[PDB]
Amino acid sequence: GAKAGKKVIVEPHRHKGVFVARGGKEDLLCTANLVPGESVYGEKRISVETPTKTEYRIWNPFRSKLAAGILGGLETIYMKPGSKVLYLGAASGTSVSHVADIVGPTGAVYAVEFSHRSGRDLINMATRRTNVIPIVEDARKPMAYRMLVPMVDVIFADVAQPDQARIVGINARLFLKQGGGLLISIKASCIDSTAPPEQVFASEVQKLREDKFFPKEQLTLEPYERDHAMVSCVYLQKEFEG
Amino acid sequence: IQILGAEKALFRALKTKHATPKYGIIYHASLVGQASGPNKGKIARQLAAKIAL
């Protein structure tokens, strides 16, 4: 496989903040480590001694739906370095560390988790990274963290709820800028377990359009997860920033 | 004495017909640190000769 000690080279991706480290027989995806010299969940990481403090961390697509979508080929992921990201469904903070490593020190990641022990893991990794704040609250009630979340630019939504579109609709009505980017990860077996997945995805896209989003891209991230889709949409506009 | 300590770059350059290093341990002395430009290498030569004496 991609064994420890192999030499890889690290080139930039098409997206900002993400890199692709290619070498030998396996090309993998990575992000620049915010706190160098320590892994979060025991991942392989990439050390380069520049002509020390520079380390990159490998982004598992089977573990994180954002890296699955990036390897699927989204047109954009909306999170440049220095952009505020509201993460909904921040279960234990595994992919939230990579989103925080994307947005860098001058950005901010507001990671909302509901369960408490996942909240403990999230508060540990947000003790390590000083740009992710942890919010242990229910994402169905965004009146709880309206003191904490300012108007963010991107929303990531990886909640597996049947009322997912309403949750994202009220969270984006409260905390998203005009023309706000978001990526929602739809799991068809949790939305509607009886209906076919393409019909489930079209119904969820129509519900987002009723909840005032304008959808611009959609990919079924198929070689990494079954019956999952990632829908990219812009809030209250057609272009992303302005 | 000019290139004590820079021996890896020295013998790499001598075996591959590159240009040898100008100084070794002598670079972190006081008197070669005041110069700037090519006068650094000139003062490294002169200082190494006076160190040998």
Binding site: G1, D27, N60, L71, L74, E75, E217, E222, P223 | -
Partner: protein
């Protein structure tokens, strides 16, 4: 005319036609075919291409 051992049995022909049309399907779309293996994540084992956008533009 001379015909094939595959053509003398109508089930075995429809078995081999399905095996090769399920094979032609993997060369167009992407099948799931199991997630990460027991060994873990050995990298994206066949390339990563950066300038390729494979999303249905709504």
């Amino acid at each position: 005319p001379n015909r094939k051992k595959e053509q003398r049995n109508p089930r075995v022909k429809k078995r081999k036609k399905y095996e090769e049309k399920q094979k032609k399907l993997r060369s167009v779309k992407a099948v799931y075919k199991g997630g990460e293996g027991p060994g873990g994540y050995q990298g994206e084992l066949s390339g990563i291409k950066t300038n390729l956008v494979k999303s249905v533009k709504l």
